[PDB]
Amino acid sequence: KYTGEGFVEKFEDILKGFPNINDVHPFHRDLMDTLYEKNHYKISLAAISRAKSLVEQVARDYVRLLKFGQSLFQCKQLKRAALGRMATIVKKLRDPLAYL
Amino acid sequence: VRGISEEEMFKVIKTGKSRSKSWKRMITKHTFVGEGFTRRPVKMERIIRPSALRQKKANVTHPELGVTVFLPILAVKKNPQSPMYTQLGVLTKGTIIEVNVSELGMVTAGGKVVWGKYAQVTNEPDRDGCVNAVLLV
């Protein structure tokens, strides 16, 4: 859960900061249209909002599946699979981060 | 397939006020539960299949064309290590399950259409919530 919140608190620092290109002003929208290309701008931020909600889904499952671990050799594996499937979302997100 | 003891996947549930009723058992491993299930009463039941450990869908990888498709499970035909866990549904490893194929749309002899296959799971779902099953070709 603590790693799961750790990725979201970084993602909540991205989706809050960027200036929300629709409904700013039709001038500030339209400098950023020519200079930053609205399509690539809106797709990459919506990829992270997809990537934020998948971290919440994996964190809420692997705490809920972990409550029936009957040994140490089973509870360790649910910890590693919970961190690995979050790393899969990050490695997949390698290209939209360098643009942002 | 390693040998799975019966002392695991069964939990001593000591019930009542004075915790001395060592009767009830809980399956601590993963289970397909069926489509229409409607739990039996608590005074009537003996064996408990919990709510969190019920995987409905499974990752179905195909050796031919190399495509992994996320497909739902319909039935559990063959379970090793007893015929008893066939009726229960314990889904450890080597369990052959009956998986539909509707999105693939394969063509048979006569070309009517194929809508279901047989797939064998390949990993313990205790280690991860994913259920990986190689569709047997």
Place this chain on the structure above:
Amino acid sequence: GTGKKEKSRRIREGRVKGENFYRDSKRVKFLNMYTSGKEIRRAASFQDSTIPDARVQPDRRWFGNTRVISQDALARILDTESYAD
């Protein structure tokens, strides 16, 4: 007294310990499941703590279609300009 005996009742109507005029013969195994899970020092029931043999034999009546169903019954801008362009 002479009539209400186990030997003289079963002749009137026509083995598990505890069968009576009451519940049944089948209820005695059923109502003894509330005390069934105990280990006696013989381990407890449904916890054998042993490794079985899990073999899957090869059968030709696999690898195929399950039942049947008939023909009668039933862009990306990331492709053009990726990110750095």
Place this chain on the structure above:
RNA sequence: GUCGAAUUUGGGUAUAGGGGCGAAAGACUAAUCGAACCAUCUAGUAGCUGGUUCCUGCCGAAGUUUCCCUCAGGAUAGCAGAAGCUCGUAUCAGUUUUAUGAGGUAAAGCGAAUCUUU
């Protein structure tokens, strides 16, 4: 808390142990009650616990077999001591060598079968 009554209390008297009495707690019945106290049968029974009183010399173990409503115990076999008896080089031995048997395990083999040709 209750305090004019289903109140409180003295004396007399009635009910005695598988019985009494109970506006019911298994309560109470002489500091004892899910069955009073006293003496006898009685030194009741225990496959369970604790203890077992002088010195030196010699020999010296077992936790294993089969059976038992047997699994904290017995019976049987094994191992051990003691008494000795018939005889006196003797038949031998937790060992090698010569000769001759039986094996199918490691290796080898799938241009052997499908689990053994060697």
Place this chain on the structure above:
RNA sequence: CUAUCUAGCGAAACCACAGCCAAGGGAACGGGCUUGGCAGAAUCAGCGGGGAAAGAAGACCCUGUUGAGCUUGACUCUAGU
């Protein structure tokens, strides 16, 4: 008003032997063993860390061919009717 000090009176629990620690091994967490740190008579008032200090051959859990109380078409009987 005690505690405290004095005159008179004056017990009990408990007790193998007794009393400074760290580490190591160890019936699985030493007052004693082994290698170290140290160590000076006699003692008074507080104190509650330890002395597995003490209240209970444990209220907890298993055993016994050991009981008792209670219940029912368990077995065997019995007063009564």
Place this chain on the structure above:
RNA sequence: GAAGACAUUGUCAGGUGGGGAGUUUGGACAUCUGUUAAACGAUAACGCAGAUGUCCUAAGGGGGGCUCAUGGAGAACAGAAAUCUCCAGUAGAACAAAAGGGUAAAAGCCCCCUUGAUUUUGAUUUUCAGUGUGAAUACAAACCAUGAAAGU
């Protein structure tokens, strides 16, 4: 006054009878094939994949005949799918069933005769205390079955 050869009382007999009395309320257990099992044998675990509390007057005996599973080439119907026929066929078939052995002029498939699946009691093998129970093997004395005969 009431009642009367009935009640009552005595002795046996059936029915009822937790109101009461005494006591009890077990701990892969009997077995056969494979494997774990490591080249004699023996060897464990709530090791393991499977069988049994039956079945047959033949599916027990004896003698005579014959070759199976399977493929190739063919025959109005009839085709991959009955019957016919030939070439190859070390058993790939079959034997009441689990499983492991063993089996080709047979232990299989078909026919001929039958009751030894009998009587008397010993010796021996397996688990083993070398006790019992079970099952088994080789003889002797009979009396039989069968076969041309040896033999069984």
Place this chain on the structure above:
RNA sequence: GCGUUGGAUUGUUCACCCACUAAUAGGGAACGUGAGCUGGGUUUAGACCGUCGUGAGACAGGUUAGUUUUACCCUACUGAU
């Protein structure tokens, strides 16, 4: 080296807000700390409701009521001859 809080809902830690602040960091010492406290909750006997049982009673369970009480001893520590 030094510092890491005040409150709000259940026996509750679990789980999560409100505001301040330089900051509201994480852990251990028999999941520190009952012969320090607490008995709130953990475990008898009283009693009710629910499920199961013919029954005695047991619980899938919920609610309420409820006795373990040294220190003067040697050591440790704070003080005193």
